[PDB]
Amino acid sequence: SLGTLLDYAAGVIPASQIRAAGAVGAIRYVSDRRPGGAWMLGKPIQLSEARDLSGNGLKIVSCYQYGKGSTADWLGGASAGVQHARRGSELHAAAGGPTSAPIYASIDDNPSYEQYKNQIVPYLRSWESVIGHQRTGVYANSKTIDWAVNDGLGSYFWQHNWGSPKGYTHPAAHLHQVEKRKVGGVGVDVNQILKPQFGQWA
Ligand code: NA
Numbered sequence: 744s745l746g747t748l749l750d751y752a753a754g755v756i757p758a759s760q761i762r763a764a765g766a767v768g769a770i771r772y773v774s775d776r777r778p779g780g781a782w783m784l785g786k787p788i789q790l791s792e793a794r795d796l797s798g799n800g801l802k803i804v805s806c807y808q809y810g811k812g813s814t815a816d817w818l819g820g821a822s823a824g825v826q827h828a829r830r831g832s833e834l835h836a837a838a839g840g841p842t843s844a845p846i847y848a849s850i851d852d853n854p855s856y857e858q859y860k861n862q863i864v865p866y867l868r869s870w871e872s873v874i875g876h877q878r879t880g881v882y883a884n885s886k887t888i889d890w891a892v893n894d895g896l897g898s899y900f901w902q903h904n905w906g907s908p909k910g911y912t913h914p915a916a917h918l919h920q921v922e923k924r925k926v927g928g929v930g931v932d933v934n935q936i937l938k939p940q941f942g943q944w945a
Contacts, residue, residue: 811851825869845942852906885916903920
């Protein structure tokens with residue numbers, strides 16, 4: 744297998760515990776904590792953590808998510824896409840992330856086709872206007888990935904299963920969230936690597 748990556752926001756996991764869990768790297772946040780989100784110790788990834796991961800031969804992938812539910816980043820369409828892309832680009836660079844690496848903008852939702860057309864499309868076009876089509880990643884279910892692919896929005900795709908049919912993997916996905924688990928007392932999700940160039944920093 745190509746391997747697995749762990750994604751997490753609640754803390755910083757030492758490189759030796761990621762290795763012990765069998766993962767080859769981590770998907771990490773290039774976003775701020777929303778007010779009251781004191782538990783989000785893993786937001787954003789910092790310079791010392793990134794050097795620790797790379798120093799221990801682990802892969803790093805950038806992902807962006809500030810809001811959630813009724814504060815989902817994409818609700819504000821184009822203006823939100825510009826503010827959030829600028830912030831993610833800033834934090835990716837601040838943690839020593841290279842411009843060759845993309846940033847997975849999060850659609851941590853199960854949107855309707857209407858919500859996709861009226862809000863996610865301008866949200867994602869704005870991510871492309873800021874960091875470019877070649878650096879725009881999309882974290883979303885199989886339907887959203889399908890709609891984005893048809894509109895030519897995003898170059899990297901990370902499938903989540905909220906709204907994805909059970910057992911279906913979109914052929915455009917680089918990464919697939921599969922799974923309820925803690926690594927060193929930090930809640931994590933496990934992600935299968937499906938394509939060899941999946942947005943790793945190096
Ligand atoms: Na707006």
